[PDB]
Homo-oligomer: 448 residues x 2
């Protein structure tokens, strides 16, 4: 019939890409478990009502909905159907949706099971999610998320452990990284002290440009964004920050005299930073950055963002502390902190840096001389496989050139010739396709 195609926004993964993806995931999994995080897997389907309202005022549009089986029009509100109100009909013809992130199903799991879990509860979750988001360059409608969360405590030792988790994970992947850290209460202190409430994004976006466009350029952008000169001048010290991150925090805390939330944010960040230095962490790799402002409506304490050093790439991870995991499900007092790894971007970074290990092909292809001789190849192949060596018999007694061409295209490093002579003599003849060298040895030497 007609020629097929991929659904928009998806792709196939062949052997090399699968193996590199699994390498990343297996490295992260192993690191998670050294840190006491246990895996959790939730279903690809959640109830529509579990996911709706969870992703912002205008986020329900981004969720993939599953059409009801059977006659899905069998119960539609008659007004809505004739009105063709697609939005109101969605809940009427669909009661299931695909996983959009990992945190909402995790909150459901905890809301459903918290009575039986042991707290503090550490879980990691590595699963595909699905997003109907507008066509953005570089992103796909299906992609893996990789999360670690611990819930049930507000202790700042958890922050310290997660910092070490990031550094060890990316060390194992071979990716040098710098972790930016801020704290939401510091931004709230800024808002209160300089009067920039509801202007934190514009302020920090501009201050973030200080190295590139200079102080005059930064101030001109803040003015254009409506930041008052009173605030710009009150925060002038943020234009002259010292080497020591700890000195910069000490300066903020003094300015936050009388602004208790700001004092608290500084104190919490000073805890994490100073413990990290005691643990050998480099203060150029873990950095206080007051312009980090991810998730202003979600994080209540620490905020993290991870970037690979020396690569033009977006962030490869972030996270932070939040007030209550299970708030939206009516279960109180489950505070938590989470981090994420950006796997597709990590993959792109590792690709650029040459970090993927060096393939799935048999080590030994046996030429197929004919039915009589091929059974003796099968015997040797089973012995190789018992010892953990991959091998296979070319399946037809084709011309040798065709068998050579196949080993060439599959990059198999050795072609094995086990003809009547080698069989009668209990030898085997191995043609190394890397060196071009050939030799005939006993089958006992070959299997040693």
């Amino acid at each position: 019939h007609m020629k097929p195609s991929l659904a928009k926004g998806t792709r196939d993964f062949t052997a090399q890409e699968v193996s590199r993806r699994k390498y990343i995931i297996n490295t992260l999994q192993k690191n998670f478990e050294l840190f006491g995080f246990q895996p959790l897997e939730t279903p690809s389907f959640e109830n529509l009502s579990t996911l709706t309202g969870k992703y912002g005022e205008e986020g329900d549009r981004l969720i993939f909905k599953i059409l009801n089986s059977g006659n899905y029009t069998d119960k539609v509100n008659e007004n809505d159907w004739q009105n063709k109100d697609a939005k109101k009909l969605t809940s009427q013809i669909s009661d299931k949706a695909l996983r959009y992130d990992l945190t909402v199903p995790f909150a459901r799991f905890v809301a459903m099971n918290h009575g039986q879990l042991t707290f503090p509860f550490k879980r990691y979750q590595i699963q595909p999610v699905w997003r109907a988001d507008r066509p953005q360059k570089g992103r796909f409608r299906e992609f893996y998320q990789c999360d670690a969360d611990v819930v049930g405590s507000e202790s700042l030792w958890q922050e310290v452990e997660l910092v070490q988790l990031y550094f060890k994970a990316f060390k194992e992947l071979g990716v040098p990284v710098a972790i930016q850290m801020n704290n939401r209460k510091i931004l709230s202190g800024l808002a209160e002290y300089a009067g920039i409430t509801e202007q934190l994004i514009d302020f920090t976006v501009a201050l973030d440009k200080l190295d590139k466009i200079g102080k005059d350029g930064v101030i001109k952008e803040m003015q254009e964004k409506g930041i008052s000169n009173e605030a710009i001048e009150k925060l002038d010290f943020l234009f002259h920050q010292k080497i020591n991150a700890l000195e910069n925090l000490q300066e903020l805390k003094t300015r936050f005299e009388g602004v208790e939330v700001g004092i608290q944010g500084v104190t919490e960040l000073e805890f994490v930073l100073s413990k990290a230095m005691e643990l050998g962490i480099d203060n150029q790799d873990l950095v206080f950055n007051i312009t980090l402002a991810r998730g202003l409506d979600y994080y209540t304490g620490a905020i993290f963002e991870v970037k690979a050093k020396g690569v033009e790439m977006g962030s490869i991870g972030g996270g932070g502390r939040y007030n209550n995991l299970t708030e939206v499900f009516g279960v109180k007092n489950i505070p938590g902190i989470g981090i994420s790894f950006g796997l597709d971007r990590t993959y792109l970074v590792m690709e650029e840096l040459g970090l993927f290990p060096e393939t799935v092909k048999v080590e030994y292809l046996f030429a197929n001389y004919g039915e009589e001789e091929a059974i003796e190849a099968m015997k040797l192949i089973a012995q190789l496989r018992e010892k953990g060596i991959s091998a296979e018999l070319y399946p037809e007694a084709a011309k040798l050139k065709k068998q050579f061409t196949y080993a060439e295209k599959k990059e198999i490093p050795n072609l094995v010739f086990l003809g009547k002579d080698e069989i009668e003599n209990a030898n085997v003849t191995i043609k190394n396709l890397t060196t071009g060298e050939q030799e005939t040895i006993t089958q006992s030497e070959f299997l040693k």
Copy 2:
């Protein structure tokens, strides 16, 4: 708000179940690669048209459809909408569907890429699929399939290799199995010789009961199913089969004199069976079973079915040879053969036999005495993690009983006490919660 729940037909997987599932998959993956099979992953979404018409006349109902994003009523056929013809509207409000099996996406991949692939092409695929199938006890709407296929050759050495693949895979899982084998041409020979065309299922279902209900009971069921006594008497020899499977095939081939398809089916099966014996395979573990009749409309040659010995369980795998992978996509001459592993049933069998290995918890929990002492625990924890040993600090300076209770509930085998004395003395005190024994050793002995 309201308390959440799982979508119907799904479940959460916690740590132990995830680790056992991954154990099965990693064992199979490793075995696949010893046999020269490379992984393939296709998207969770396929175009609706890719999947429709592929799963039988009444199979489209079993596919999960994804509702179009946006105003999905924006283009509906006006007659169909007012008619509320749900079935005709499906293609109008949905153009995507979830993966239903692995073979159709594999055929799409090959149809799309065959010009660039090297044949014979070996792939394995281990991915979740989604089925709206009616509520059957023991099955879930989301579950993993595990397939291996090789395409591009009709060689019966491929059958032989797949038999060995099954045996090695299940040996590694620790599951003793018997593999039933038949061949579709043998059943066609039966149909032609005894005149039982369109009665093969009823015949074989009844003959399958021979051990339990006896020959008189089998014949009475065949009569009730409309099998003629002429056929029952022509096939009387199938009621008196000898020990040697090879003798039973030789008898069939003689009776198939003049029935060329039957001769061919016997010849093809005799090849696979006799090569397998030469390779050391036990003829009680690989068995010719003329009543095996999976996939009568799909398999053209060998048919396999795998059962665990000594466990009341359904089949844990099956497969066989088919005519042309890419037939439905308009690409000819890609013959192939495939096998499948039933992972949920394999899991149930391994559970019954006690085959899962013996858990994700830290080896060492450090008690938290307070902020001053806790940093020294963090230092030791990092050293343990560098050596590959899992550990963590209890995150709050709680009462010891609470920290003991946590290690108890998490089954952590060791609690570590690193108080002011052990710190000043460069010692560590380890409480083994398995033996109840406690001891204080140097930190040098501990880290050795």
